[PDB]
Design a protein around this ligand. Sequence first.
Ligand SMILES: [Mn+2]
Ligand SMILES: [Mn+2]
Ligand SMILES: [Mn+2]
Ligand SMILES: [Mn+2]
Ligand SMILES: [Mn+2]
Ligand SMILES: [Mn+2]
Ligand SMILES: [Mn+2]
Ligand SMILES: [Mn+2]
Ligand SMILES: [Mn+2]
Ligand SMILES: [Mn+2]
Ligand SMILES: [Mn+2]
Lengths: 94, 94, 105, 107, 98, 100, 86, 79
Amino acid sequence: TRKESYAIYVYKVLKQVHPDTGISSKAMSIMNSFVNDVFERIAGEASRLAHYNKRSTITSREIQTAVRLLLPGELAKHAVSEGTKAVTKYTSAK
Amino acid sequence: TRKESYAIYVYKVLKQVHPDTGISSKAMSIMNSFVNDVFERIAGEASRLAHYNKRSTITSREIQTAVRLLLPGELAKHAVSEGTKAVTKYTSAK
Amino acid sequence: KTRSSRAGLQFPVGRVHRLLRKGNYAERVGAGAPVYLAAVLEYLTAEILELAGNAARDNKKTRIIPRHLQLAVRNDEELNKLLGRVTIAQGGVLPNIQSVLLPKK
Amino acid sequence: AKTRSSRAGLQFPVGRVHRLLRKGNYAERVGAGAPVYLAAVLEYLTAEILELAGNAARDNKKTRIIPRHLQLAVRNDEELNKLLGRVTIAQGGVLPNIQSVLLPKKT
Amino acid sequence: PHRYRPGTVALREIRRYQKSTELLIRKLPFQRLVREIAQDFKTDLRFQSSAVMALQEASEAYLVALFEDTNLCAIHAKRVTIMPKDIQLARRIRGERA
Amino acid sequence: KKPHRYRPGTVALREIRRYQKSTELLIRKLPFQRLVREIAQDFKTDLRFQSSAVMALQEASEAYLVALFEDTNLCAIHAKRVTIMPKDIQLARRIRGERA
Amino acid sequence: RHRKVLRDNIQGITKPAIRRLARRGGVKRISGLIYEETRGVLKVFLENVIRDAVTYTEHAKRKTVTAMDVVYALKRQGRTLYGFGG
Amino acid sequence: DNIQGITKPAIRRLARRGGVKRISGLIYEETRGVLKVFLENVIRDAVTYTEHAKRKTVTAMDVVYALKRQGRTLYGFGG
DNA sequence: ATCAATATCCACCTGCAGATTCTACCAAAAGTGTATTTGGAAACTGCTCCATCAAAAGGCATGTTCAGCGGAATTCCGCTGAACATGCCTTTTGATGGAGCAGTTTCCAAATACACTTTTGGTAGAATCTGCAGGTGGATATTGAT
DNA sequence: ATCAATATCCACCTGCAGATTCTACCAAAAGTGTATTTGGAAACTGCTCCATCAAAAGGCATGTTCAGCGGAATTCCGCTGAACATGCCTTTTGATGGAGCAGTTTCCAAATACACTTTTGGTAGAATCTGCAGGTGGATATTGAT
Ligand SMILES: [Mn+2]
Ligand SMILES: [Mn+2]
Ligand SMILES: [Mn+2]
Ligand SMILES: [Mn+2]
Ligand SMILES: [Mn+2]
Ligand SMILES: [Mn+2]
Ligand SMILES: [Mn+2]
Ligand SMILES: [Mn+2]
Ligand SMILES: [Mn+2]
Ligand SMILES: [Mn+2]
Ligand SMILES: [Mn+2]
């Protein structure tokens, strides 16, 4: 009967930007819907992108173009940096 | 260089409805966009339905509920009736 | 002999099956799904061809052009709603002038 | 043996994101960099809303962020407002906003 | 016998409601309306209580935004009073009406 | 022999009647083609366009402006005018949710 | 057994409740005919959403409309709702 | 300039087709501004699809995909 | 401007419902080793994209004039806001019966990938085919002056 | 009501751009049988949570009275746009070589995925912790009469 939620990660990020602020269960539910919603939007644009180009794989490149098509100007710029940074850092290990 | 399209079938249907009416190439192109558009809307809704209910199969049932969610009243009623007739007429074969 | 014929259809059941399997809709595609889908597509196509055909005959033409498709769809309450967010190229619009704009008779 | 999140420098779960991408029937395959890049974007957007919501909570002298603080944060920020332009936040209310012509007469 | 002028209490009302987030339609009456409409589509349906609340949060958000657009329509016509023709123009422009 | 002139609004009505009957593009092509390349150039320099791509852009832009003008007309008439103004277009876009 | 009969419940959406929603919407003056007009727009809105939610319910072969059915129905109509698992 | 190349008469025709009878003089510049915003939004996405496929030619399909995701689906150019 | 009826802000006060912390299981992440592919790089060809001269002339731009639209000012009928009195019905909290829903277990019909076989669907030199766009004559309608 | 300037309409005529039919290619598909798997339907069933209602309590809906002031009719007239005619700048179409750059095939190395199986990062439930809803009261602020 269990059910995953992004709650613990949303909470970690909250502690990082506002160390002394908590969050109600209804706000957290809103935050979880938001993450799920953005995940589907980006995954769907990436899925579409791959099909249009006849590729059978979704790579970081499709996520990047998808983020670029989905987010408004400035949020797109910062998301791409954070995404690119994470990939490069992940690639530099192991 | 082969490029598939629904053109020959749309033409076959045009003959059953209006034996003496032809169609321009631009109108055919519009009809091809129409079939592709409805195919995607219906298949997409069918995919979500199966994912919402945790099944890995898209059956005539998902197609049917999809049509019901997507088409306006009477159109829905007739499409379901054609879809059901076609499945019966196909199971009643050798 | 031919999946489309066993179903009583002109639209290609096999092609629809393949489009469904390769579209990433789900892991598996039921055998009847492409049958039902193809029939729905054929029906909608006939519905639009039937009204576009009538529009062609009304303007005294034998060949259906985009304009006839637009006239057919915008004059039919239900197709207009289904295609509510679609633009038919070279379709023009329905003749329609607001009554307050007509000259005083 | 480090988690993929840690290795990526993220708080959001790369592994879970990878799996959700796999079960979503988005494509036949999912490259290893896709979930990392996607997890970072999700974490960035959530840090962005929480920063602004947290400020809204402090402005109303509150320690706990509630739905109203998320709505104030999204509606007062041009870009988030656009990203969530067709989204309704339960219990969010609306921004105070009265049309000028409606105000008591003079000036 | 004190009296606020017409418009004075309406403005205080706008300030008070734009400040809160509480649902504005009574709960039971909304729940009966939902059951009645649903019963007309299919008899014998039950409802998780959170399904009714979700319908109420969506319905109120939709009407509040519709009144905002309706008010802009009234003001465009040099009025401060909304009328049925304002709501109809707004719904027509939104594509909710033919 | 001749003087003659139609009243204001009479030719405007024949033009509506004539343009609602036809389906041809109403903005000149070359000027449109230039607008398009100019705008594309601000996003990525040295691009080429298939001719059907410029056409798709024109059919879409024209169908959009025409539907916007219909909504704009309803806003002018709502205010009891038969003349559309910038404020009518702004109201139509605001309600449509295109922002003002 | 025997659930009482439901009828005329749209009148349960009172004139006072309607002025409140309008206040939240920034409206200062309301004409007497607005109330019935609003009631008619609300019914159309509920019918459309409940119809789709019930369609999701029936497809799942259930008799109980879940918050998820309502959330999916609002989503497909482009009225995405956050806060209920959606 | 280019946007200026979209003429008053062309703007008037589009309006006639829209059932408009009388046009104020400030309408022409207002329209031009709306057309440019519309084109920027669609061309931006089409070019983004062009770059993604590593091309230097904007295709009809690129425009069609861009119109579709902006909720302006267009029939007649493929897809 | 002066004073009175009222509402608004806000800071302290406090029990508690709701949130943040501690615990022992288990889906579900994370290394290996094959076995298998996707799709990139490059050489390469030819589809169409670009830039352009050159007639033909179709529209745009400018300017003059004035018909009539839009908006300001004034007026006043009656609609809608404010407020009051009365009391109905919503809300909150339990209390109970049980309709349904979801989580194992068992198992048969149905779907997949491979492999192999026959043909339909796409293409295009082919061209004969043919609907109707445009152009003309001449009859009648519409419009707007007088 | 009477002209007369123009618009609009119908019948007919015909070349040709674009449509339907001929046709042979041939890679590509659609499809049939098989051996492997598994997705998901009854039947059973624990037990969540939904429907229903009643008491108590008071918030808030209903219905009336009173009159402030909003909306909209009428009139008027300034000046913005519509109509039109003059002048010519610029688009449009087609014949026309130069070249950019799509997109196909082949070779092949990096990079997937699925079954194994080891280890732990979440999750649900129990325990532990605390923000702020809502009442009080009181100083300041806003309205609206005079
Ligand atoms: Mn009923
Ligand atoms: Mn390959
Ligand atoms: Mn007037
Ligand atoms: Mn009462
Ligand atoms: Mn064949
Ligand atoms: Mn003709
Ligand atoms: Mn003649
Ligand atoms: Mn007034
Ligand atoms: Mn070069
Ligand atoms: Mn641990
Ligand atoms: Mn308080």
